Design an enzyme around this catalytic site. Structure first.
Site, PDB file in Angstrom:
ATOM      1  CD  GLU A 126      27.941 -12.197 -35.979  1.00 25.68           C
ATOM      2  OE1 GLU A 126      29.054 -12.831 -36.219  1.00 25.68           O
ATOM      3  OE2 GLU A 126      27.115 -13.194 -35.807  1.00 25.68           O
ATOM      4  CB  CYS A 197      30.393 -20.230 -34.233  1.00 23.38           C
ATOM      5  SG  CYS A 197      28.589 -20.689 -34.614  1.00 23.38           S
ATOM      6  CB  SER A 225      17.468 -17.909 -38.216  1.00 28.31           C
ATOM      7  OG  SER A 225      18.889 -18.608 -38.256  1.00 28.31           O
TER       8      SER A 225
END
Ligand code: F3S
Length: 310
Positions: A126, A197, A225
């Site tokens: 990301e 988020c 993750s």
């Protein structure tokens, strides 16, 4: 032994969409469907798509002309996006809208030639994608992981400076970084708080509620993750035993011990079957019926692009 379930937990709106993008491309076009890097950071999900005909590749180079290519939920840099454009490929983008939102801010800063600072974790896809939205030598794009990184940083013009964050960060840690940023650079511009988020914020709140109740917390998720590691770290930090696990097999009896209360959650890329497996295992180690903790409502859905509706 009491078993508690955090809520919310597991799939976020961005992960649901990314998976449906791959599943629907396979339904519409047949196998193979090429996906650049793991679509989401969960090995159970990735194994299941691969079994159904997805081929996870490293480089656009490896994808043959005429194929269907999918970008992962984490997003890609403009360089990667432009390489695929130059190829004879059909591309669908599974980047989460809440990542694209950050990409758009980095791009605006770039056109203006004003420096931007991203809070995130070096090496994460990301971050590679968000940093890769910036392309102006007159400005600059810098990554900062920690408050020390902030105090280390030299900037060309601190009067024209802004920041952005990775979506899956520790809210508490990120607050510490932002404090340093606004103290070290008083005129820095940003969001009200961060670009973390709704799913991350909510999942970290639910695991905090879980961890105040439970002596042991199992977080379902893969090692790569980021958001799932943040869950385990949050619980660990409150003085609880927390373990990040891929499946029920990973549970060791020694952890369940003479524990009066065990909590289970899941990161944003982990399917609920896995937490149900974990509960089934805990019950065979003396656990009772699973008690779900009450949680914030989530109501956001992101739709598949229209060409992929089924
Ligand atoms: S940025 Fe998007 S992909 Fe999931 S973890 Fe957050 S909703």
């Amino acid at each position: 032994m009491q078993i508690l379930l955090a809520n919310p937990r597991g799939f976020c709106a961005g992960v649901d969409r990314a998976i449906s993008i791959v599943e629907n491309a396979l339904a519409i076009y047949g196998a193979p469907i090429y996906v650049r890097h793991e679509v989401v950071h969960n090995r159970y999900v990735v194994d299941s798509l691969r079994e159904r005909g997805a081929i996870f590749i490293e480089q656009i180079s490896e994808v043959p002309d005429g194929a269907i290519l999918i970008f992962s939920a984490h997003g890609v840099s403009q360089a990667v996006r432009n390489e695929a454009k130059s190829r004879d490929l059909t591309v669908f983008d599974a980047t989460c809208p809440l990542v694209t939102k950050v990409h758009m801010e980095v791009a605006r800063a770039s056109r203006r030639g004003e420096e931007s600072i991203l809070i995130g974790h070096a090496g994460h896809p990301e971050v590679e994608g968000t940093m890769g939205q910036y392309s102006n030598p007159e400005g600059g794009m810098y990554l900062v992981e920690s408050p020390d990184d902030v105090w280390k940083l030299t900037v060309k013009n601190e009067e024209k400076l802004s920041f952005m964050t990775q979506t899956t960060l520790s809210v508490d840690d990120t607050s510490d970084v932002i404090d340093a940023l606004r103290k070290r650079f008083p005129k820095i511009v940003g969001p009200r708080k961060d670009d973390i988020c709704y799913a991350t914020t909510n999942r970290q709140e639910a695991v905090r509620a879980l961890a105040e109740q439970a002596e042991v917390v199992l977080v379902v998720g893969s090692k790569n993750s980021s958001n799932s590691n943040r869950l385990a770290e949050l619980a660990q930090r409150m003085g609880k035993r927390a373990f990040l696990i891929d499946d029920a097999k990973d549970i060791q009896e020694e952890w369940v011990k003479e524990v009066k209360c065990v909590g289970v959650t899941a990161g944003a890329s982990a399917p609920d079957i896995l937490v149900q497996n974990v509960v089934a295992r805990l019950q065979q180690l003396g656990g009772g019926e699973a008690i779900p903790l009450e949680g914030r409502e989530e109501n956001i859905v992101f739709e598949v692009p229209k060409e992929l509706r089924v």
